[PDB]
Amino acid sequence: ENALLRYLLD
Amino acid sequence: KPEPTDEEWELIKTVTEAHVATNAQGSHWKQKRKFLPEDIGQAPIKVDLEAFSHFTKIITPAITRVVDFAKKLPMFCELPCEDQIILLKGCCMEIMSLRAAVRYDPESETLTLNGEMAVTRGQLKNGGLGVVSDAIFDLGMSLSSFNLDDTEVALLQAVLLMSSDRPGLACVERIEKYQDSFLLAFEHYINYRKHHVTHFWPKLLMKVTDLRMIGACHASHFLHMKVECPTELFPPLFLEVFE
Ligand SMILES: Cc1nc(C(=O)NCC(=O)O)c(O)c2ccc(Oc3ccccc3)cc12
């Protein structure tokens, strides 16, 4: 659900 | 009073470098500083929409720098992904406030956000933060006497990031091991620095609590902003971190 924050954590 | 071990010096090099590399505008933050115009952020007639949109537009890079900090910490990287997400959502507002508070300027009575934007107690208050504005400004005023350097700020951020009490964490004992290491390095560095304040370490621990209050408040003032602004009006990275 934290799509963007997950992406930023690579 | 004991000073850092070699392992603790190495750890202090790591956090300090992580912090310096991710602190907006670095040494130049007072030069790149634009004072937000004074008509922006005066008291309505609730939330001043103009100041809100300026604050809305800089929260995203500020959250991203916090993420960049955590990623340059090797202990953080060994945590599973959901732990990292939980730990970041937990400490993002805490670390941003610390980073703003140590940039309090008593002559102008402003904080600098994003290395670039000087705002007043009234502007940050009327742009959505409410009483939390006073909390961050009061913290800045009182930190001036603590003369924190880059390393003490870095270590404070690591202590807040490594909080094993956030709801949902798998590796709770692992995270508390990491925090304990930082707390020990932090104390021994404080012993070595020999500040000229009595019981510096106990007083700094109360500052940690002040920050954890600012962080726990952002729920009571997330709702205070969603009274007026539809959820579309916030940037997405902010919504993720704050709910
Ligand atoms: C608490 C803090 N801090 C910083 C910041 O830059 N701190 C220093 C730094 O990271 O270098 C911000 O940029 C903030 C931006 C918005 C904000 O709330 C709001 C978010 C959306 C709408 C209104 C206020 C709090 C900030």
Numbering used by the authors:
A (entry chain C): 741 to 750
B (entry chain A): 211 to 255, 263 to 460
Per the authors:
As ligand-regulated nuclear receptors, THRs have a structurally conserved LBD that allows the binding of distinct ligands (Burris et al., 2013). Following the ligand binding, the function of THRs is mediated through the selective recruitment or release of specific coregulators, like the family of steroid receptor coactivators (SRCs) (Li et al., 2003, Jin and Li, 2010, Savkur and Burris, 2004), as a heterodimeric complex with retinoid X receptor (RXR) (Putcha et al., 2012, Kojetin et al., 2015, Mangelsdorf and Evans, 1995). Although the defects in any of the processes in thyroid hormone transport and synthesis can all contribute to RTH, in most cases the disorder involves defective thyroid hormone receptors, resulting in reduced T3 binding and disruptive thyroid hormone signaling.
As expected, the native ligand T3 abolished or substantially diminished the transcriptional activity of four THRβ mutants associated with thyroid hormone resistance, V264D, H435L, R438H, and R438W, respectively (Wakasaki et al., 2016, Nomura et al., 1996, Sabet and Pallotta, 2011, Narumi et al., 2010). Surprisingly, the treatment of roxadustat either enhanced or retained the transcriptional activity of these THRβ mutants, all leading to higher induced transcriptional activity than those of T3. In contrast, the binding of roxadustat resulted in higher Tm values for four TRβ mutants than that of T3. The structural analysis further revealed an apparent conformational change of residue H435 on helix 10 of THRβ for all four mutants, resulting in the loss of a critical hydrogen bond between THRβ and a critical hydroxy group of T3, which is also conserved for the other THR ligands identified so far, explaining the severely reduced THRβ activity by T3.
